[PDB]
Amino acid sequence: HVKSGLQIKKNAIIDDYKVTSQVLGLGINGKVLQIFNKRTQEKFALKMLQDCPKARREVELHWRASQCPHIVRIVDVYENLYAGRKCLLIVMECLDGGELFSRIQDRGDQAFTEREASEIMKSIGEAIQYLHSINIAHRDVKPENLLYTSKRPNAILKLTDFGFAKETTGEKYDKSCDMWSLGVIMYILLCGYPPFYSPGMKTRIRMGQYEFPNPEWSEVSEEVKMLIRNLLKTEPTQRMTITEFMNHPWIMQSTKVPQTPLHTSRVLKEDKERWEDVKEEMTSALATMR
Numbered sequence: 424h425v426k427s428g429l430q431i432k433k434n435a436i437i438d439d440y441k442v443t444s445q446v447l448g449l450g451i452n453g454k455v456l457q458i459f460n461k462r463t464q465e466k467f468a469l470k471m472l473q474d475c476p477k478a479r480r481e482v483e484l485h486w487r488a489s490q491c492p493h494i495v496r497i498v499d500v501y502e503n504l505y506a507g508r509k510c511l512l513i514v515m516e517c518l519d520g521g522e523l524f525s526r527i528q529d530r531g532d533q534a535f536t537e538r539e540a541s542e543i544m545k546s547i548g549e550a551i552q553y554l555h556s557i558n559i560a561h562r563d564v565k566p567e568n569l570l571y572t573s574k575r576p577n578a579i580l581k582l583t584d585f586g587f588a589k590e591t592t593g594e595k596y597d598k599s600c601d602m603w604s605l606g607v608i609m610y611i612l613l614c615g616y617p618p619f620y621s622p623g624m625k626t627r628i629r630m631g632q633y634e635f636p637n638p639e640w641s642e643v644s645e646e647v648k649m650l651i652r653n654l655l656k657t658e659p660t661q662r663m664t665i666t667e668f669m670n671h672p673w674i675m676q677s678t679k680v681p682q683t684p685l686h687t688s689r690v691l692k693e694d695k696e697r698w699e700d701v702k703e704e705m706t707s708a709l710a711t712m713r
């Protein structure tokens with residue numbers, strides 16, 4: 424199987440796009456902006472990286488991944504002087520749907536089911552599987568990097584930001600922290616809070632306590648808890664791999680998973696005061712996992 428290599432454009436990007444000033448997010452090495460094609464008037468996202476060997480490898484690895492149905496797509500890459508710095512400008516497909524958990528938290532009826540958690544986990548897992556099978560580890564899988572293509576209920580979930588991705592050839596355990604990220608994301612999808620030991624808020628997980636508290640976890644199957652314990656296993660030598668994950672009946676047959684009603688959407692609203700703290704705890708943790 425043969426895919427073509429990245430042809431970087433040298434002409435001024437502004438010959439092709441109107442470049443606005445609105446932020447669409449904040450990345451590892453820069454800011455994402457809103458732009459429009461001129462000849463089609465269509466909308467797109469732009470990432471600006473200052474040219475250097477690191478940015479070069481981010482663009483390459485992301486390019487290898489681009490065609491995966493669940494990874495954000497690269498439309499073109501420009502090499503320009505942009506405000507007196509030499510930059511790689513990355514044009515990507517626009518993702519209006521928003522961030523994964525933001526969309527779940529905004530559900531007016533608050534009815535999120537185990538079956539939906541499963542389908543979401545299946546989408547993310549396909550992105551990780553694509554990457555791991557060509558020996559790339561993403562290494563920044565977390566809430567702000569999982570976005571929906573449109574606001575439609577049927578929108579596709581996409582993984583973004585390759586600012587930490589690396590080639591793993593030889594060092595295979597670089598892939599493990601991606602699997603841990605899946606464990607954490609799956610756990611949050613099922614109850615509405617992280618499996619972390621941490622105001623006028625409820626404490627969801629007491630320090631040192633059994634990790635599936637009865638209020639939210641009582642109707643979840645022991646099978647699903649075992650899946651999670653495998654993903655969150657402490658030793659990378661023992662943690663589940665992406666192949667084992669994608670072969671688990673809970674992911675493989677996500678179509679036929681119990682539509683068990685979950686507390687997730689409800690807890691995301693109640694605890695939204697501490698969401699930034701969750702994302703921070705995961706960012707810190709991830710820095711020590713990878």
Ligand SMILES: COCCOc1cncc(-c2cc3c(ccc4c5c([nH]c43)CCNC5=O)cn2)c1
Nearest residue numbers: 447448449450468515517518519521522583584
């Ligand atoms: C606050 O989010 C709610 C959703 O808001 C919108 C609205 N319109 C477009 C986007 C968007 C963000 C992107 C992206 C392609 C790549 C990336 C990256 C980020 N954000 C993005 C941030 C982190 N790293 C990225 O590469 C493509 N599109 C997002």
Ligand SMILES: [Mg+2]
Nearest residue numbers: 489490491494
């Ligand atoms: Mg893609």
